[PDB]
Short mmCIF file of C-alpha atoms in Angstrom, two decimals:
data_model
loop_
_atom_site.label_atom_id
_atom_site.label_comp_id
_atom_site.label_asym_id
_atom_site.label_seq_id
_atom_site.Cartn_x
_atom_site.Cartn_y
_atom_site.Cartn_z
CA UNK A 1 14.22 -0.73 -27.76
CA UNK A 2 16.26 -0.30 -24.55
CA UNK A 3 15.26 -0.22 -20.98
CA UNK A 4 16.90 1.06 -17.71
CA UNK A 5 15.59 -0.06 -14.41
CA UNK A 6 15.53 2.41 -11.57
CA UNK A 7 15.17 1.50 -7.81
CA UNK A 8 16.30 4.25 -5.62
CA UNK A 9 15.73 5.69 -2.07
CA UNK A 10 17.17 8.80 -0.61
CA UNK A 11 16.46 10.56 2.81
CA UNK A 12 15.02 13.98 2.46
CA UNK A 13 15.12 16.32 5.37
CA UNK A 14 16.98 19.55 6.71
CA UNK A 15 20.23 17.44 6.36
CA UNK A 16 19.51 16.41 2.85
CA UNK A 17 17.71 19.10 0.94
CA UNK A 18 18.10 18.08 -2.67
CA UNK A 19 18.17 15.06 -4.91
CA UNK A 20 18.91 15.37 -8.60
CA UNK A 21 17.87 12.30 -10.70
CA UNK A 22 19.27 12.10 -14.32
CA UNK A 23 16.89 10.35 -16.62
CA UNK A 24 18.60 11.58 -19.87
CA UNK A 25 17.95 13.39 -23.09
CA UNK A 26 15.71 11.16 -25.39
CA UNK A 27 13.86 9.21 -22.67
CA UNK A 28 10.62 8.53 -21.03
CA UNK A 29 9.94 7.35 -17.54
CA UNK A 30 7.19 5.08 -16.25
CA UNK A 31 6.98 4.42 -12.56
CA UNK A 32 6.50 5.94 -9.10
CA UNK A 33 8.06 8.62 -6.83
CA UNK A 34 6.95 7.84 -3.21
CA UNK A 35 7.14 10.49 -0.43
CA UNK A 36 7.47 7.88 2.22
CA UNK A 37 7.40 9.92 5.43
CA UNK A 38 6.38 13.17 6.92
CA UNK A 39 8.44 15.93 5.01
CA UNK A 40 6.54 17.84 2.25
CA UNK A 41 8.74 17.68 -0.88
CA UNK A 42 8.87 19.64 -4.06
CA UNK A 43 9.29 17.77 -7.35
CA UNK A 44 10.59 19.60 -10.49
CA UNK A 45 10.16 17.62 -13.69
CA UNK A 46 12.45 19.08 -16.35
CA UNK A 47 12.31 18.35 -20.04
CA UNK A 48 16.05 19.40 -20.33
CA UNK A 49 18.89 19.05 -17.96
CA UNK A 50 6.57 24.46 -12.21
CA UNK A 51 7.23 22.28 -9.16
CA UNK A 52 5.00 19.64 -7.70
CA UNK A 53 4.52 19.79 -4.09
CA UNK A 54 3.89 16.28 -2.57
CA UNK A 55 2.50 16.21 0.91
CA UNK A 56 3.59 13.49 3.52
CA UNK A 57 2.82 9.97 2.19
CA UNK A 58 1.75 11.13 -1.24
CA UNK A 59 2.79 9.20 -4.48
CA UNK A 60 3.62 10.67 -7.96
CA UNK A 61 2.81 8.19 -10.69
CA UNK A 62 4.33 8.44 -14.17
CA UNK A 63 3.24 6.87 -17.34
CA UNK A 64 5.40 7.39 -20.50
CA UNK A 65 6.56 10.83 -19.24
CA UNK A 66 9.35 12.64 -21.37
CA UNK A 67 11.62 13.92 -18.56
CA UNK A 68 15.38 14.48 -18.69
CA UNK A 69 15.72 15.24 -14.84
CA UNK A 70 13.72 14.90 -11.68
CA UNK A 71 14.65 17.20 -8.92
CA UNK A 72 13.36 16.60 -5.46
CA UNK A 73 13.68 19.34 -2.79
CA UNK A 74 12.85 19.63 1.02
CA UNK A 75 9.98 22.19 1.00
CA UNK A 76 11.18 25.28 3.20
CA UNK A 77 7.79 25.43 4.98
CA UNK A 78 8.51 22.10 6.62
CA UNK A 79 8.00 21.81 10.42
CA UNK A 80 11.65 21.31 11.54
CA UNK A 81 12.78 17.81 12.16
CA UNK A 82 10.44 16.04 9.65
CA UNK A 83 12.03 13.65 7.12
CA UNK A 84 11.07 11.38 4.33
CA UNK A 85 12.33 8.34 2.55
CA UNK A 86 11.82 9.34 -1.12
CA UNK A 87 11.58 6.30 -3.37
CA UNK A 88 11.87 6.34 -7.18
CA UNK A 89 10.99 3.12 -8.94
CA UNK A 90 10.30 2.44 -12.59
CA UNK A 91 11.60 2.13 -16.05
CA UNK A 92 13.44 4.45 -18.46
CA UNK A 93 12.50 3.70 -22.00
CA UNK A 94 12.05 5.61 -25.30
CA UNK A 95 8.97 7.71 -25.67
CA UNK A 96 6.14 5.69 -26.81
CA UNK A 97 3.43 6.71 -29.13
CA UNK A 98 0.80 6.73 -26.31
CA UNK A 99 -0.41 9.31 -23.96
CA UNK A 100 2.03 10.89 -21.30
CA UNK A 101 0.52 11.11 -17.89
CA UNK A 102 1.02 11.77 -14.23
CA UNK A 103 -1.32 11.24 -11.17
CA UNK A 104 -0.95 11.82 -7.63
CA UNK A 105 -2.48 9.64 -4.85
CA UNK A 106 -2.29 9.41 -1.03
CA UNK A 107 -0.88 6.12 0.03
CA UNK A 108 -2.07 4.41 3.19
CA UNK A 109 0.15 1.11 3.60
CA UNK A 110 -1.89 -1.90 5.09
CA UNK A 111 -0.53 -4.59 7.18
CA UNK A 112 -2.03 -8.09 8.08
CA UNK A 113 -1.87 -9.49 11.53
CA UNK A 114 -2.41 -13.30 11.67
CA UNK A 115 -4.89 -14.70 14.18
CA UNK A 116 -5.46 -18.24 13.24
CA UNK A 117 -4.43 -20.86 10.59
CA UNK A 118 -5.77 -24.31 10.58
CA UNK A 119 -7.88 -26.85 8.62
CA UNK A 120 -10.98 -28.13 10.34
CA UNK A 121 -14.61 -27.09 11.43
CA UNK A 122 -14.13 -24.96 14.56
CA UNK A 123 -11.49 -22.80 16.37
CA UNK A 124 -9.42 -24.18 19.43
CA UNK A 125 -9.76 -21.08 21.57
CA UNK A 126 -11.08 -17.51 21.80
CA UNK A 127 -8.96 -14.77 20.24
CA UNK A 128 -8.85 -10.94 20.91
CA UNK A 129 -8.80 -8.67 17.88
CA UNK A 130 -5.79 -6.11 18.49
CA UNK A 131 -7.00 -2.91 16.68
CA UNK A 132 -9.62 -1.13 14.73
CA UNK A 133 -9.75 -2.68 11.13
CA UNK A 134 -11.15 -5.37 9.17
CA UNK A 135 -11.28 -9.02 10.07
CA UNK A 136 -10.61 -11.31 7.25
CA UNK A 137 -11.88 -15.06 7.50
CA UNK A 138 -10.79 -16.94 4.51
CA UNK A 139 -12.65 -20.48 4.28
CA UNK A 140 -11.58 -22.77 1.53
CA UNK A 141 -13.98 -25.53 0.61
CA UNK A 142 -15.24 -27.77 -2.42
CA UNK A 143 -18.61 -26.28 -2.30
CA UNK A 144 -19.66 -22.58 -2.79
CA UNK A 145 -21.92 -20.38 -0.69
CA UNK A 146 -22.84 -20.95 2.83
CA UNK A 147 -20.03 -22.78 4.94
CA UNK A 148 -20.82 -21.97 8.72
CA UNK A 149 -21.15 -19.39 11.28
CA UNK A 150 -18.80 -17.25 13.42
CA UNK A 151 -19.65 -15.48 16.74
CA UNK A 152 -17.98 -12.16 17.87
CA UNK A 153 -18.55 -10.22 21.11
CA UNK A 154 -17.74 -6.71 21.71
CA UNK A 155 -18.72 -5.36 25.21
CA UNK A 156 -22.31 -6.07 25.89
CA UNK A 157 -22.79 -6.89 22.10
CA UNK A 158 -22.80 -10.24 20.50
CA UNK A 159 -22.81 -10.69 16.55
CA UNK A 160 -23.23 -13.84 14.60
CA UNK A 161 -22.40 -14.06 10.94
CA UNK A 162 -23.27 -16.30 7.94
CA UNK A 163 -19.81 -17.35 6.76
CA UNK A 164 -19.34 -17.98 2.99
CA UNK A 165 -16.58 -20.03 1.32
CA UNK A 166 -13.91 -17.54 0.22
CA UNK A 167 -12.98 -14.33 1.82
CA UNK A 168 -15.40 -12.81 4.58
CA UNK A 169 -14.52 -9.20 5.50
CA UNK A 170 -16.04 -7.87 8.54
CA UNK A 171 -15.33 -4.33 10.14
CA UNK A 172 -14.14 -4.84 13.79
CA UNK A 173 -13.20 -2.63 16.74
CA UNK A 174 -10.18 -3.28 18.85
CA UNK A 175 -10.87 -5.74 21.85
CA UNK A 176 -13.41 -7.63 19.93
CA UNK A 177 -13.48 -11.24 20.81
CA UNK A 178 -13.85 -14.17 18.31
CA UNK A 179 -15.90 -16.29 20.56
CA UNK A 180 -16.49 -19.24 18.18
CA UNK A 181 -16.76 -20.65 14.59
CA UNK A 182 -18.57 -23.60 13.23
CA UNK A 183 -18.17 -24.98 9.82
CA UNK A 184 -20.47 -27.51 8.12
CA UNK A 185 -17.43 -29.36 6.58
CA UNK A 186 -13.52 -29.41 7.08
CA UNK A 187 -11.98 -26.47 5.33
CA UNK A 188 -8.66 -24.60 4.93
CA UNK A 189 -9.06 -21.62 7.50
CA UNK A 190 -7.10 -18.36 7.64
CA UNK A 191 -7.97 -15.58 9.77
CA UNK A 192 -6.24 -12.28 10.18
CA UNK A 193 -6.91 -8.48 10.40
CA UNK A 194 -6.19 -5.86 7.88
CA UNK A 195 -4.95 -2.84 9.89
CA UNK A 196 -3.80 0.57 8.74
#
């Protein structure tokens, strides 16, 4: 069989109303169309060269979908001045003898904020958590199970945690202090926050 790789992004706004993507006649597409931004978009999937309205941040997933053309349009109901970066990524290949499917999901990108890297049994100072999110304390050690203790303070509240080898995931509010950590043997330590 033959495969064509698709990696495209186009702005869609009042200034860029339409994108026409040719997939071609005897072909199937597997991949993603990503509405990265604030413009609602209308997606027409045409078997030869019914629209799907994608709201801000939505992703249209394709598996083995026989399409000859994908048309993307700025929806006329948009608040003026909104735009999106519309990304098409995937593979064009022949129609496989398996189900053809689409699905849609909301994307919420996550970003990791480093707090501490080291290798030892405690922290060298206190740290402030910058945002609402999830604090990740990764402790690497030869043994499994219990590996030490961490103390967080937030306002007039103190919290102490039974740290395990591996990834420890704690929901945290912005401004929370990492006041101390004590491990029972020297370990690779990586502390960061998952933020949305």
